């Protein structure tokens, strides 16, 4: 199983326009089988790419199609670990005006 240890932007934090989201897990995850939904006050936000840059596959980089505008964001994640096991969660953050 892959449990979410931390994320940037951090849950319930307020940040200036981040370039991407970075979700760090307790075991490797598979970008090809993992799903991530991003929404801004109900509005689905386009994601252009998912990728695990590192050998250990523990960090998932989620790249929006467009730079994030100010607002309230929710992340819904369904992770698939290298052992094929499924985990899921959600969290929110804010992009400061
Ligand atoms: Cl992270
Ligand atoms: Cl995040
Ligand atoms: Cl999305
Ligand atoms: Cl998992
Ligand atoms: Cu498992």
What can you tell me about this protein's structure?
This protein has 97 residues and is mainly β. It has a single domain (4-95), classed as Immunoglobulin-like. It has no helices and nine strands. It has strands spanning 4-8, 14-15, 21-25, 35-40, 43-44, 47-51, 59-64, 71-80, 86-95. The protein has a five-stranded mixed beta sheet with strand order 2-9-8-4-5, with no helix packed on it. A four-stranded antiparallel beta sheet has the order 1-3-7-6, with no helix packed on it. The protein is elongated, with a radius of gyration of 13 Å. The protein binds chloride ion (4 copies) and copper (II) ion. Residues 1-2, 79, 81, 85-87 line the site of one chloride ion (CL). Involved in copper resistance. Cu(2+) 1 binds at residue 1.
What attributes does this structure have?
Immunoglobulin-like, copper transport, 9 strands, 0% helix, Copper binding, monomeric, 97 residues, 5-stranded mixed sheet, metal binding protein, elongated, binds chloride ion, mainly beta, binds copper (II) ion, 4-stranded antiparallel sheet
Class by SSE composition: mainly beta
**CATH topology value:** Immunoglobulin-like
Number of strands: 9
Task: Output the radius of gyration.
Answer: 13 Å
Biggest sheet statistics: 5 strands, mixed
Q: Write down the overall geometry.
A: elongated
The domain count comes to 1
The small-molecule ligands in this entry are: chloride ion, copper (II) ion
Q: Count of DSSP helices?
A: 0
Largest sheet strand order: 2-9-8-4-5
Query: How much of the residues is beta strand, in percent?
Result: over 45%
* CATH level-two architecture: Sandwich
Intertermini distance: 37 Å
The CATH class is identified as Mainly Beta
Q: Percent range for helical residues?
A: under 10%
Helix and strand pattern: EEEEEEEEE
PDB class: metal binding protein
Keywords: Copper binding, copper transport, metal binding protein
Assembly: monomeric
Entry title: PfCopC mutant - E27A
């Amino acid at each position: 199983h892959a449990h979410l240890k931390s994320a940037t932007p951090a849950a319930d934090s307020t940040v200036a326009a981040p370039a991407d989201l970075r979700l760090t897990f307790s075991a490797g995850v598979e970008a090809t089988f993992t799903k991530v939904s991003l929404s801004k006050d109900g509005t689905e936000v386009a994601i252009k790419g998912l990728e695990t840059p590192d050998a250990d596959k523990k960090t998932l980089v989620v790249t929006p199609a467009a730079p994030l505008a100010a607002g309230n964001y929710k992340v819904v994640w369904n992770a698939v670990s290298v052992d094929t096991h499924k985990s899921n969660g959600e969290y929110s953050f804010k992009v400061g005006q």
